[PDB]
Design a protein around this ligand. Structure first.
Ligand code: NA
Ligand code: NA
Ligand code: NA
Lengths: 211, 211, 211
């Protein structure tokens, strides 16, 4: 063993070992524990290449305790001319035909979070796609609004419909008969005893078609 | 070149080079290859800061061969008082106006996986949002259940509707006329020859409105 | 301080410090800046283990400027026998009961991207689930096609319906009355003045049920 009381600088560091090759611990209010930087401006060089051959353990663990930031924060620095149309911030490949591996898995093992499970926020003023902690889904709703149904879709822009279905729509019997409609007016379409019914905004209930 | 036959300890390691700055290889059944740890409890210090200026290659590659874990596993250690409402496990920023970069891209280049493409599982007993390997989507279905349509939504909790649409609903002609309904009863709404039809649970088929 | 003019090799590198423990900078068109490799084929060893105790800063930052690749690229090397049914490429755990932390957050802080916010592409020829830069959503649409509504669902495979709703469907009044239908034929279902209406493919408009 060799102990340097100060910093070491070198052209390169390498270890091929049965010990843990690196343990880098920093305690500071200003310094990161590690910076890895690829300054090349072309070629086949990444900043960081991580590989595991061990099937019994995650190739990589990341744990944080942030109050107002992402545990992993990924920035893609794009191009004003749109020459990055084939790039992504995050790309996942599930390789090997026959695999049953999942793509993205999100849970909360001590109990449900009160925060959004996913929030895609590209267009100003909107939640393009959001799944709330409650499980309700918004599609084009006002940003940070509470969805007013299990799934809430708003027709935006020059879209000609809120919803297109190329196929049939099954509607199960409602467990509770509606007594109201949405604040956007219109009405409530539901099944009751196998029949199709509409409650309109003025409170008229019509059986449209029988069981 | 300098070869240490044993471990090296130092106050800091730095390299500014044209070689690969670090190669850390471990072969073990108990040791990780590398641990990076920020022990600070406040300030602007991260554990790991990775940057690339090379547009021709991913800033970071991660490859694993896990049988029952995530290739990247991210844990956010939260707070019982909800003081982490602005935090996230994963945060992506697509910067530079004019960019055409994508957010999240998932595929399976050797053939389709049999596992879930995404599974958001916050609430006990439920799949809040799941996209199966088949492409079917569940919203509030029982956890791990097979969706019973291309998209299957269940009205949960105190939601007043399964689906709210602020706009019109287009229904294309069904390629195959329904001959059955869902196990939750109710019926099947479909278009046929431009007309709107309902099949009820007792098998009655009604043309509600003409083409 | 100690300066090595050449490469250093050792059995292990460790630092427990108040400085940044590691700064690894490479400028090259062929070399990565760092490779971390777990060559073990069993056990509890990961390649990389990253931990932060600092709540004021992301545990990990990643920044890239790719034109045609992912900033973070994750590959899971699977198994032909499906013995990886419990594995995932990305796994997120929001821990601590009471937490309000979010799962996945995606935005574009300089203005909207023109690329897909999320694209799940498992089945050949299809977009299983895609959210376009515009916010439109496709479910089973042809891969890379533009959705023809805010949400566009296609009944695929042996699914018996495009959409199943176990609950009621609220339809708000349409801000603009439809004057056309989809290219898949059928018609347009909408609310108008609290009433339910259908426009069929031949242009007939029927009030199905009153407000
Ligand atoms: Na639009
Ligand atoms: Na609820
Ligand atoms: Na199917």
């Amino acid at each position: 063993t060799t102990t340097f009381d100060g910093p070491v600088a070198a052209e390169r560091f390498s270890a091929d070992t049965t010990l843990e090759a690196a343990f880098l611990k920093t305690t500071s209010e200003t310094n990161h524990a590690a910076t890895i930087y690829q300054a090349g401006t072309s070629g086949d060089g990444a900043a960081l290449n991580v590989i595991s051959d061990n099937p019994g353990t995650s190739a990589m663990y990341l744990s944080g305790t942030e109050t107002a930031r992402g545990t992993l924060k990924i920035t893609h620095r794009g191009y004003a001319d749109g020459s990055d149309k084939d790039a992504a911030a995050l790309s996942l490949d599930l390789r090997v035909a026959g695999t049953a591996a999942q793509g993205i898995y999100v849970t909360a093992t001590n109990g449900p979070t009160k925060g959004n499970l996913i929030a895609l926020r590209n267009n100003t003023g909107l939640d393009d796609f959001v799944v709330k902690g409650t499980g309700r889904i918004g599609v084009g709703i006002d940003r940070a609004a509470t969805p007013r149904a299990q799934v809430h879709i708003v027709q935006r822009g020059d879209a000609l419909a809120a919803l297109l279905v190329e196929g049939s729509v099954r509607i199960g019997n409602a467990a509770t008969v509606p007594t109201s409609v949405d604040s956007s007016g219109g009405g409530a379409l539901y099944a009751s005893g196998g029949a199709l019914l509409w409650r309109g905004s003025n409170g008229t209930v019509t059986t449209i078609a029988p069981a």
